[PDB]
Scaffold this active site. Structure first.
Site, short mmCIF file in Angstrom:
data_model
loop_
_atom_site.label_atom_id
_atom_site.label_comp_id
_atom_site.label_asym_id
_atom_site.label_seq_id
_atom_site.Cartn_x
_atom_site.Cartn_y
_atom_site.Cartn_z
N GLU C 163 0.67 -1.15 -0.01
CA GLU C 163 0.08 -0.02 -0.06
C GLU C 163 0.85 1.09 -0.14
O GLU C 163 0.46 2.36 -0.65
CB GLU C 163 -1.01 0.08 0.99
CG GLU C 163 -1.97 1.11 0.97
CD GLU C 163 -1.68 2.51 1.70
OE1 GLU C 163 -0.72 2.61 2.28
OE2 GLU C 163 -2.41 3.41 1.61
N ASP C 210 -8.29 1.55 7.85
CA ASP C 210 -6.88 2.20 7.74
C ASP C 210 -6.84 3.42 8.69
O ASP C 210 -7.81 4.27 9.05
CB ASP C 210 -6.95 2.72 6.32
CG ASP C 210 -5.28 3.05 5.92
OD1 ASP C 210 -4.54 2.42 6.58
OD2 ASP C 210 -4.88 3.66 4.97
O1 LIG Z 1 1.29 8.36 2.05
C1 LIG Z 1 0.93 9.47 1.95
N1 LIG Z 1 2.10 10.19 1.73
C2 LIG Z 1 1.49 11.86 1.47
C3 LIG Z 1 1.99 12.86 1.09
C4 LIG Z 1 1.12 14.10 1.16
C5 LIG Z 1 -0.26 13.86 1.31
C6 LIG Z 1 -0.84 12.93 1.43
O2 LIG Z 1 -2.07 12.33 1.67
C7 LIG Z 1 0.18 11.38 1.61
C8 LIG Z 1 -0.35 10.15 1.79
C9 LIG Z 1 -1.54 9.68 1.99
C10 LIG Z 1 -1.97 8.54 2.67
C11 LIG Z 1 -3.41 7.93 2.41
C12 LIG Z 1 -3.84 6.93 3.20
C13 LIG Z 1 -2.91 6.14 3.58
N2 LIG Z 1 -3.16 4.93 4.52
C14 LIG Z 1 -1.97 4.58 5.09
N3 LIG Z 1 -1.15 5.57 4.78
C15 LIG Z 1 -1.61 6.65 3.97
C16 LIG Z 1 -1.26 7.69 3.49
ZN LIG Z 2 0.49 5.49 5.50
#
Ligand SMILES: O=C1Nc2cccc(O)c2/C1=C/c1ccc2[nH]cnc2c1
Ligand SMILES: [Zn+2]
Ligand SMILES: O=C1Nc2cccc(O)c2/C1=C/c1ccc2[nH]cnc2c1
Ligand SMILES: O=C1Nc2cccc(O)c2/C1=C/c1ccc2[nH]cnc2c1
Ligand SMILES: O=C1Nc2cccc(O)c2/C1=C/c1ccc2[nH]cnc2c1
Ligand SMILES: O=C1Nc2cccc(O)c2/C1=C/c1ccc2[nH]cnc2c1
Ligand SMILES: [Zn+2]
Ligand SMILES: [Zn+2]
Ligand SMILES: [Zn+2]
Ligand SMILES: [Zn+2]
EC number: 2.3.2.5
Lengths: 323, 323, 323, 323, 323
Positions: C163, C210
């Site tokens: 993921e 999540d």
């Molecule tokens: O991983 C990520 N790196 C980012 C850098 C800038 C903005 C962002 O939204 C993110 C981001 C989003 C995200 C979304 C769902 C997730 N579930 C687990 N980790 C998650 C991470």
């Molecule tokens: Zn994450």
């Protein structure tokens, strides 16, 4: 006369640095509080009762045994109720009663009166057994520092009796203990000898703790004349968060949020508010879901929130008192 | 000693099923009620007035014609005003006037006095003809079930006169009807022969309807000692909606929003609150835009909303009584 | 392409009684979850690593020992990344794979790649080991009730790999294991023999967990084709509260708050959503404070909130399946 | 890879004490900026155009005359458009050849193309001439401290060209300087000689200032990988507030409010954002009222808000840079 | 080209005085619309079905029969789908095909496709049978002032086909008709023989009706280039209300609340929006609770709300059109 009564209007906290706050956080124990300060109090303890005396003894005992030169007084009095004249007893605990200015922390040790029902008893865990234990647990956790007091300013605790209505909440049937002592103090000159100033001119601030104990409180900013001090609990809450020192906590579930409130809540502070004592009313809005239910018991208290408030409050005080 | 005046804190509704709900929603007819019950009330009816006697009269006729054993009274009484002494007649309908405990619904049947403007007349359709019609329709629609009343509890209605001020809002120029009735009830042994308990002891919950009928009402939760009952309205509203029995209705415009209201509104509940009766004040906030204008007329009523609240109130009331 | 794929649109839950709910709350242990299902996964485990195989291994064992007949598959696959091709593996655990319709619970079990700093390792306590243990605790707790799956509906859990991004959040670098599985399933007749219907047809609803395990979470309702399922999460939360079976829980900090969200979080649902699968995305907004920090450890988890969401989710799931 | 690309994840700032914060706040004249750094730019200046070259020139001149080792660069280039190919010219100004890591501030110096109307000419005062001016002034007011650069980190200022569309907003018709500058840096090794890592790997945080200069702006927390830096802008604004250093400012009218945002604004950060750069997008939501109207001039700029934001930013930067 | 296509950018409306506003209200009849305009559309009417043809024909007869010189095209076309190639027929109705500029209003006349469930059938009342009618009725209601078009500006309606996905929402599977007509207008010069300006350049604003007709809608102000016309829709709803020209309507349940939106709704405007046509998207947020359920029927429409939106729309069009 002298102007010391205006001092309260200019008095600043002695903010504490990170290491200080780590110490305070480590100095209070929620379980000690829970075992030795609070479980004694979860009894039917409405005015009159064996409870009331057992509770009363318990408070002083626990105060008595500390190193700081606390001056417990009782103030038994008599007042009319819708069942006749009944007898009440306020608890005061003072450090340095000659301290012209005191910061006051207060709550209410009586339990509302209910008929047993289904063989249950109202014991008022949040209303207000927990706030009694917090004040207790602050006298302990802060004892070494509170000893330093042998600005003319020290600390009083007040445990009021007969806060709740006997039958039905009205101005006539409510706040027996605080309407008594508001008056008594407004007519006791302070410092001894004085000629124009009362024991109330020497209340800097009254911190009233009421209904603390439940998950997810939010405390409003009730008064403009104590708002600066509400802001400080906002700042303390924040910094103790930013530093790791709170449990199961998030700033999107802050306790103190800049939310002012509409109409007034009636509580042991009113006999003081309207005589001009600045007040900080640490009561939540909305009240707990268990308010005046038999379910206001030990089982429904969030130890983890209470711990977080113990810390916030203990800091608030050292900062006021410049310890 | 009997503790029956406490039975009210432990009182629980007997909640209804989806057949039942469908049945209720079925047997209430906003259109009959509009023609038969409310259109007569829409006249200048300030105390004194011919309107007042008409309305008084109307009200009693439509109750007198139902099958259940209602007992109507006309407490007519004198009381002082800014325009000298004057006469008020409250209307009290009651089932089982030995039903020791009573749930009480209530409103005011007068209309405020206003001179005539551009040959327009103030008729108070939300302030408060609609609540009066609502009450009368509920007795109609529930009739066959109310018969069942031959826990010792029954239902009672009140239509207060002189709620509005003659000249200008004040303790002294207002609530003539309810101030009067609250006293006379505080001083009346209930039940006959009782020695220490008055009829107020027998009032469970006072549901007071004011300012209903405008679009997009929002009813705050005003008091913590009736708040589980306000929760039931929330919950009734919800199910009647998820089951598709409300009209033009969405949850983004609920009527009972879990929002708490700062102050106190002044109204006919006051004399009963300050004596310790619980109140469920179904008044909206903000008041309706047409409030106390000549526009508080029928053309500005929302049929659909009134009909939705009928269902809600009717179900509340059956669940309270266990019918 | 029969008409079974539209039954999802009419599916309705088999709501539970207060006695069931009690059994459901009482038959899930958050402490057994804590040691057997969650403490093992708290290890560095990005894709490829040796952690990935150990966490992978843990999961299956914890499933393999239960009575329901879970059919584990493994879905190892190769994809390019910014550091070159690498080998991922999705876990899929299916009941009744011939079950033409399935409700799907999913999380992700990789951990973000980070170099170690100050000798701490990133382990992803909320991102997303709690979710894995939630899903693992749910199958334990509900095991016996799930043998009864021998409407044609069953339950599938999925633990996605890859993921998280490797180097820099982007469609090319993220969701490696769910881009793959969408497409894989999007093109796999279901049931066997079918001719027009893919396994995505048979996906009733995908519940994506999540970022769960911090205090004071707020989950939004993100998508209209699943609101009704969100609403049931709302109602479960309410009901478990009003029966007393949540802990340190207040309704002024509900978890599921009817609040719609604007934009979209990218997460493993996206490859199924833009394939027309209904998604219930249980990811909170705002993210936890410890997101993507080394502080997303065990120390900063709220055990109470996870017991609570576990009870809720377990309930949600037995009602979905009419068990 | 090496480890340095991840140092940014762990960077903490050197928070300034009070005395310092004052010294910064006296450091910045909004009047000097207003007349020296901003008024030259209030000219039609769409790409290609003479104000495009006069703007470019002016900017440079103001950097050149600072002590600090600003290394300027033009990056003239050429891209396809809806009016044919045309030539752009980004400006980059860097301290430190090798500064492995850079904080970047950025802003766009073109002006949308608009034919003339009622003899009026679009000069984008807030879009984005004030941001420019702001960046200049921060160069100016922090020179002497920026000298102290001869943790391996420094500053960089970018002034993109080609931000606005030539005709009609779209991916292919917008963001000309920045889509080009992010691809070029994503393909240049840094540091010089590197076998694995780009100048993007070196961009610590891109602070993009767009649409600044209107009264009462609120900036949201757009992105979670830069939320801690958002929080710091808040802490700065509170602290600069409570020390008296801001003008016409209340905390009831703060700029940086904890109000996340749903979906994304398209601006010059996108090319960098999808390439994994963390972004602090100081753009307001809602956009200014004058957005894309001839009315976006000087007469509609709130000088007080800009002074305040100068202060806030210059602090933000001195603290990122441990200067 | 020239600048004639920058005129949209400056168009001010010709606002109506109260007296005119009353006529317009008087001028439209929701009972006429309901019976003669919408009830025919309440049939299964997906693309290719007989309903579709039924429905396609109805529209045209309702416009043929008016006196203004509506000019009906019919873009019929083929496109691929998850079920094959199929045929789709837009409907377009212009006044002054040669009028360079055009205010365009549009909705969609297809119904999603559903199997038949419990002998029930999906007909799409809100989506989008009401907006079709609202536009029909707009043209009836306004015919006489529309005639006054023999600012080179006139009016256009569009009833898109195939907006709804056939299988599962997705860029490949949705907006069939708008994608077609957008691309076909982008590549049609206008006015005839123009050498670099297309029909889309002479779309001054596109007003898209969708999901209209449910209780309690709230419409976000979705785009900044169209915001100033959302502020007109607001000023209109206000004045019509402040004249008692709307029914069952409070300003505390406004339809147009000045709240901006985060993400973006995918609807038939996309293909014009990413080609640079201003959009006022009249779709509510949230969606109707009945969206894509069988209860999206006539039984659940709010006649009062629709009647109120007719008035608002008919005024908006006239003040744009300077009629
Ligand atoms: O991983 C990520 N790196 C980012 C850098 C800038 C903005 C962002 O939204 C993110 C981001 C989003 C995200 C979304 C769902 C997730 N579930 C687990 N980790 C998650 C991470
Ligand atoms: Zn994450
Ligand atoms: O005691 C009460 N009986 C009531 C009946 C109706 C409405 C009310 O607000 C009250 C009430 C208030 C109250 C206020 C502060 C308290 N602190 C502890 N108990 C407290 C109770
Ligand atoms: O009658 C009134 N004259 C006022 C003047 C200034 C402020 C006010 O709140 C009032 C007022 C209040 C009021 C309150 C409850 C009512 N229920 C029905 N009519 C009601 C009226
Ligand atoms: O330029 C634009 N034309 C639009 C048409 C419809 C919707 C939109 O958001 C835009 C838009 C956005 C935008 C974003 C950041 C900007 N910074 C300076 N100008 C800016 C403009
Ligand atoms: O058709 C749709 N199926 C969806 C499933 C999940 C999320 C979504 O936003 C949609 C969706 C969007 C949509 C948008 C505008 C419409 N107008 C009429 N129907 C409309 C539907
Ligand atoms: Zn109490
Ligand atoms: Zn009134
Ligand atoms: Zn712009
Ligand atoms: Zn639709």
């Amino acid at each position: 006369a002298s102007a010391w009564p205006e001092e309260k209007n200019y008095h600043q906290p002695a903010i504490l640095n990170s290491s200080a706050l780590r110490q305070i956080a480590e100095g209070t124990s929620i379980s000690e509080m829970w075992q030795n300060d609070l479980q004694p109090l979860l009894i039917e303890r409405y005015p009159g009762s064996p409870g009331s005396y057992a509770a009363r003894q318990h408070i002083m005992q626990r105060i008595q045994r500390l190193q700081a030169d606390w001056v417990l007084e009782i103030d038994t009095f008599l007042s009319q109720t819708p069942y006749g004249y009944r007898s009440f007893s306020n608890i005061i605990s003072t450090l340095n009663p000659t301290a012209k200015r005191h910061l006051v922390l207060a709550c209410h040790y009586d339990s509302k009166y209910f008929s047993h029902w289904n063989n249950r008893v109202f014991v008022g865990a949040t209303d207000s057994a927990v706030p009694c234990a917090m004040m207790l647990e602050l006298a302990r956790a802060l004892d070494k520092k509170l000893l330093s007091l042998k600005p003319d300013l020290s600390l009083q605790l007040i445990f009021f009796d007969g806060e709740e209505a006997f039958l039905h909440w009205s101005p006539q049937d409510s706040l027996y203990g605080s309407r008594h002592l508001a008056a008594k103090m407004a007519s006791t000159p302070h410092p001894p000898g004085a000629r124009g100033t009362s024991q109330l001119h020497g209340m800097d601030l009254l911190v009233l703790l009421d209904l603390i104990g439940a998950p997810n409180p939010t405390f409003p900013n009730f008064f403009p004349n104590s708002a600066r001090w509400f802001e400080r609990l906002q700042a303390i809450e924040h910094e103790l968060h930013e530093l790791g020192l709170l449990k199961d906590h998030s700033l999107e579930g802050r306790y103190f949020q800049n939310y002012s409130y509409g109409g007034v809540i009636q509580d042991d502070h009113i006999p003081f508010l309207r005589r001009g004592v600045p007040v900080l009313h640490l009561i939540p809005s909305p009240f707990p879901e268990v308010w005046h239910t038999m379910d206001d018991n030990e089982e429904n208290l969030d130890e983890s929130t209470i711990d977080n408030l113990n810390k916030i409050l203990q800091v608030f005080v050292l900062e006021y008192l410049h310890l």
